[PDB]
Amino acid sequence: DWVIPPISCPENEKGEFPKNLVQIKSNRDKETKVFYSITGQGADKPPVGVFIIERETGWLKVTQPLDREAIAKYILYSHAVSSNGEAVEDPMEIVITVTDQNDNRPEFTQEVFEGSVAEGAVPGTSVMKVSATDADDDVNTYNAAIAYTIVSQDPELPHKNMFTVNRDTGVISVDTSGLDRESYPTYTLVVQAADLQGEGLSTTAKAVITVKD
Amino acid sequence: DWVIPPISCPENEKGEFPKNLVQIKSNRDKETKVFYSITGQGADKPPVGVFIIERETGWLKVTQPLDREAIAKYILYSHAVSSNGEAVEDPMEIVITVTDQNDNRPEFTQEVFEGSVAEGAVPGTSVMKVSATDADDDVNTYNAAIAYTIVSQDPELPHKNMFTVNRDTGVISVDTSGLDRESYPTYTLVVQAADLQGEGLSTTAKAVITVKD
Ligand SMILES: [Ca+2]
Ligand SMILES: [Ca+2]
Ligand SMILES: [Ca+2]
Ligand SMILES: [Ca+2]
Ligand SMILES: [Ca+2]
Ligand SMILES: [Ca+2]
Ligand SMILES: [Ca+2]
Ligand SMILES: [Ca+2]
């Protein structure tokens, strides 16, 4: 039973429906009459009706917007039957992949993350980890590929950039030194998560670092 | 035989060969080991060896650069057998479309075109036609959409731009008044054709216009 190269249909389509994807067709339709149908989840089983097939020509259509983040791949079967009811083909297994769009913003595991460092640790010691998630397609695109930046430090002394964040790991480390509890005892960092490798959709959270003796 | 939706492969690929197109696979391989082959012009018949299928995996592969302007479509059949060589599927018909690149420069029908106009003619009167052809795919791309321009006018009197060319059609026109046979009896224009609607590959030729009483 052949399985068909995947038919791509992007999520969140808009406008008039139904829309044509792709024609599936027996080359025996000059020998005898051929009537097409499809079965499976997305066709005659839940969700019913997302895809339909023009009985007579074999144009496969989609009848509504899709959401990759709810169903990413549909498997159906097509059938080719003649007037006398005989099968003109074995069923063909039909694979449809929902193609991703970047329609989910990253989200931080917490709105405020807490750590602490020692006064005289050392430019590149580990303070804490911040983390986001993105629900988009981490396998075939960058839409869920998260770059952590630092947006602002408070207060800005002794110098701006007392800290850095590793843009992939979200691990926060000491960048320059002169950390002095008694001059400046807590810092409030605004941290950013952005997909498209830094360029895309973004969100912010807070990291509150307590300077210790 | 089912005919599957066409697989696109662009002309003029560069780099490492063979390149993978698409996995053509039987779902009957849970039961028994399956072995795949292909046939047709471009596989086992001339041009032999353009496409191959990997026997155990069913990856379909193209083995060299294609040229849309020599062959635009291939038709193959895939086949599926078990260790003993018996068939576990009917064959599947496989269509392959070669997609276009802008690899053809427009050519003028002539190197020098000839035309004429009456001294008295009013701005807007049509003088003559220049015309070019492009061999790229004028049905699905812009690689053949030609735009025309006048590059230079000799002589430049009584004004620059005695003439104009309609930039979709190649119709050359009287633009401003003052044509007088007895002061300037011919003009030589350099005309240009460029595809991608003017932004792409270009060529030039000459238009010679005799001003008549
Ligand atoms: Ca979605
Ligand atoms: Ca998405
Ligand atoms: Ca995203
Ligand atoms: Ca101190
Ligand atoms: Ca070519
Ligand atoms: Ca071409
Ligand atoms: Ca061209
Ligand atoms: Ca005159």
B28 CB contacts (<8 Å, ≥6 apart)?
Answer: A1, B34, B80, B88, B89
Q: How far apart are CA B5 and CA A95, in angstroms?
A: 12
Please state the separation of Cα B37 from the chain's center in Å. 33
Residues of B with Cβ-Cβ distance to A24 under 8 angstroms = 2-5
Q: What residues have CB less than 8 Å from A159, skipping those under 6 apart?
A: A176, A178
d(CA A194, CA A201): 5
Alpha carbons A130 and A108: distance in angstroms, whole number:
8
CB-based contact B75:B57 (threshold 8 Å): no
Which residues lie below 8 Å from residue A56, measured CB to CB, with a gap of 6+?
A: A35, A36
Name A194's bridge partners.
A147, A202
Question: Which residue among A26, A28, A93 places its CB closest to the CB of B27?
Answer: A93
CA distance B67 to B137: 12
Dist CA B144 CA B140 (whole Å): 10
**CA A122 to ligand 4 center in whole angstroms:** 14
CATH architecture under which domain B102-213 falls: Sandwich (2.60)
Assigned fold of A3-101: Immunoglobulin-like (2.60.40)
In the block, which residue shows the tokens 């010679």? Answer: B208
CB contact under 8 Å between A89 and B1, yes or no, is yes
Tokens of A155: 């207060």
The total of other beta-carbon atoms located within 10 Å of residue B201's CB is 17
d(CA B50, CA B42): 5
Residues of A with CB under 8 A from a CB of B: 1-5, 7, 22-28, 78, 80, 89-90, 92-93
R_g of chain B, CA atoms, integer Å: 28
Show residues of chain B in contact with A4, CB under 8 Å.
2, 4-5
How far apart are the CA of A36 and the centre of ligand 7, in A?
Answer: 41
| Ligand 7 geometric centre to CA of B7 (Å) | 23
For residue A125, give both structure tokens. 């010691």
Please give the backbone phi and psi of residue A165, each rounded to the nearest 5 degrees, phi first. Answer: -110, 125
- How close B77 comes to chain A (CA, Å)? 12
Among B8, B74, B67, B65, residue whose Cα is nearest residue B44: B74
Report residue A156 as tokens.
């800005």
In angstroms, rounded to a whole number, what is the distance separating the alpha carbons of residues B156 and B190?
13
Method by which the model was determined: X-ray
Sorted by sequence, the CB contacts under 8 Å of residue B108 that are 6+ apart come out as B130, B131, B132, B191, B193, B203, B204, B205
- What's the gap in Å between the CA of A195 and the closest CA on chain B? 30
Cβ(A52)–Cβ(A13) below 8 Å? no
> B139: exposed, middle or buried (C-beta count within 10 Å: 0-12, 13-18, 19+)?
exposed
Amino acid at B96: I
Ranges for all domains in chain B classified under CATH 2.60.40.60: 3-101, 102-213
Closest Cβ opposite residue A26 in set B2, B23, B89 = B2
Residues with CB under 5 Å of ion ligand 8 are B 180, 182
Question: What is the interface size between A and B, counted as CB pairs within 8 Å?
Answer: 52
Peptide linkage before A106 cis (omega within 30 of 0): no
Q: What's the CA-to-centroid distance between A199 and ligand 1, angstroms?
A: 19
Tell me the C-alpha distance between A207 and A188, whole Å.
6
Q: Which residue of A has its CA nearest to B60?
A: A5
Beta carbons within 8 Å of B70's beta carbon, 6+ residues apart: none
* A137-to-A11, A14, A86, A169 alpha-carbon distances in Å: 12, 20, 42, 19
Nearest Cα of chain A lies from the Cα of B98 at a distance, in angstroms, of 17
Locate B183 and state its tokens: 């002061």
**Residue B8 phi/psi, 5° resolution?**
-80, 130
Provide the sign of the torsion angle of the four alpha carbons A135, A140, A143, A147, taken in this order: positive
User: Cis link prior to A158 (omega < 30° from 0)?
Assistant: yes
| Mutant choice from A2, A23, A57 vs B, greatest count of B C-beta within 10 A | A2
Tally the residues of chain A.
213
Q: Is A103 annotated as a binding residue?
A: yes
